[PDB]
Paper text:
[name] is a cysteine protease that mediates the cleavage of viral polyproteins during viral replication and is a high-profile antiviral drug target. The [name]-[name]-2 [name] ([name]) is the drug target of Pfizer’s oral drug nirmatrelvir. The emergence of [name]-[name]-2 variants with mutations in [name] raised the alarm of potential drug resistance. The X-ray crystal structures of the representative [name] mutants S144A, S144L, M165Y, E166Q, H172Y, and Q192T with and/or without GC-376/nirmatrelvir provide a structural explanation for the drug resistance.
The structures of [name] (apo and GC-376 bound) and E166Q (apo) were also determined for comparison. [name] is a high-frequency mutation with 4682 occurrences and remained sensitive to all three inhibitors (<4.1-fold change in Ki). The catalytic activity of the [name] mutant (4.2-fold lower in kcat/Km) is comparable to that of the WT. Collectively, the results suggest that M49, T135, N142, H164, and Q189 might be able to accommodate multiple mutations without a significant compromise in enzymatic activity and drug sensitivity. S144, H164, E166, H172, and N142 mutants impact the size and hydrophobicity of the S1 binding pocket.
Numbering used by the authors:
A (entry chain B): 1 to 304
B (entry chain A): 1 to 305
Write the structure that this text describes.
Amino acid sequence: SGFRKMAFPSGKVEGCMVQVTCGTTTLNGLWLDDVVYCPRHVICTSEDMLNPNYEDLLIRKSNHNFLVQAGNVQLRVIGHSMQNCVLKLKVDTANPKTPKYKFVRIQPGQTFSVLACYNGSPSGVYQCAMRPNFTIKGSFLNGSCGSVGFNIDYDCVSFCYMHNMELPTGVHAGTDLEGNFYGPFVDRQTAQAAGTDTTITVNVLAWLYAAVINGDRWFLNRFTTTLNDFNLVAMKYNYEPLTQDHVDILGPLSAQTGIAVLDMCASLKELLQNGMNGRTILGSALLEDEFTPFDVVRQCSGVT
Amino acid sequence: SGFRKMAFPSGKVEGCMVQVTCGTTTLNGLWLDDVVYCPRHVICTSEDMLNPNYEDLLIRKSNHNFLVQAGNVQLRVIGHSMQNCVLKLKVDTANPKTPKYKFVRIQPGQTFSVLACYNGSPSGVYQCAMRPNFTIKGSFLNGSCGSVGFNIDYDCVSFCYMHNMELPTGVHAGTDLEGNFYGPFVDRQTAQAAGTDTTITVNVLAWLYAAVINGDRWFLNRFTTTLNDFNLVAMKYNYEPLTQDHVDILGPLSAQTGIAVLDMCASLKELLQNGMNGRTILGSALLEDEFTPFDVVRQCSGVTF
């Protein structure tokens, strides 16, 4: 028993991380088959970043201007193409450590593991949620750009995130592996509004189920509610509205614990209206929204 | 910027995890050079665990009673020895994925990464603190026994923990890789007192420094305090007493932020006396004690490997 914010084992991703250098600028790349993926702002100086014309900047560059190092091995770049906000560097060698992999665009509310890297070398691994406003609250210092987010389904790595920038607010924005930003962000150093963020309601309910399973039951009340009644309270506290799709996803946790989803909603409603009175749930003094229903099921059934 | 509870990259450890089976019982083993390490209670049935004589139980077993599988490959066991609460199974093949490694006994308050495994297959990775009472608050289901805790210093994996048992209270106890339990625990299914836990004061101060560095500064006061004055408040709130050794370890974070350790102590004192008034520090509504001063420095300076 017990419940922890758990990342996927990072081994399969560690073997794909490389260093990409273009003039002064060094960041991280993802080496899969004979292609290296990295943020296109590798081609920018600190001045360029204020208002870059990426097409014009990339034209000034040739294959030999891209230094790609896999640990101590230097890769030979035989091609370069821009796809949205990512650069695809064709190299002469297939990565022998290429795992079975997919590129996926994740939905807001979904979670993934980040392997934070500097100069193509792994620093650490942690589990993130994509916020409803398409930002992440990561740990990303200078040089962390090109660090990737992923899920693992047995043998298959689903790459969903490549770190691109820190907004002035200190929150993080990135792209899928086709180089399309999550949210309304562009790769230039301007002030950019992230939307109003909201709490991921289905994740909070999943974590309350995790709590009951591990024997934290104090918050279970004598009340029930309707989807409509609950959603009026959700709106007031900046929680995502709960849909029948969400109720359906919580079904297995409902079945295990014998607490109907709407009964757990009534518990959450009372927590929102009355706060927690300085009590804790699974060692947290606030409501946690970075566990999906699938995350709770994985951990509470020991999937490998 | 930003601050997260970060585990070490688990790649070097993943390649060392194997499945060990002895009759009915299956758990995880650590394959380094030509030796597999696992908890000795692999040789026990659920009945044996109530009051096991490990010497007598191990004598009933030979090399061929130990099934060791590395993914899909089966290893040949040519030797078995009991060292404290761990079994060392000598195998005919050196692990070609053996990293540079050390066995270290960690101190209470120190942190490490756990690779939670089932049937010799990695499930997930997370950062733990060894509690002052030598327990850990992990996530460990049936079959997680033999899962290991580690730190990485560039190329070298320091194995410090092997998961052994869940206490009736749902907290976790384990051994070093020489099989010596952390704390007063034994490998039998009895009621065992963990004894009073305390908050790791030096870790809370380190995390307050992490907070200042990342721009959370609301808790900073101009009140100050003495080691003696602070430790009277520490005792009242079940915090470890702060020593000069602890002040010295926080020195670099003090130097970076320009906040003297005793000033940060006065901020912590008011947080303890007055609570946080429903505010958050680095997205937490309570005081976090599972980051060491070295953890904060590593993350706030981007150390790799």
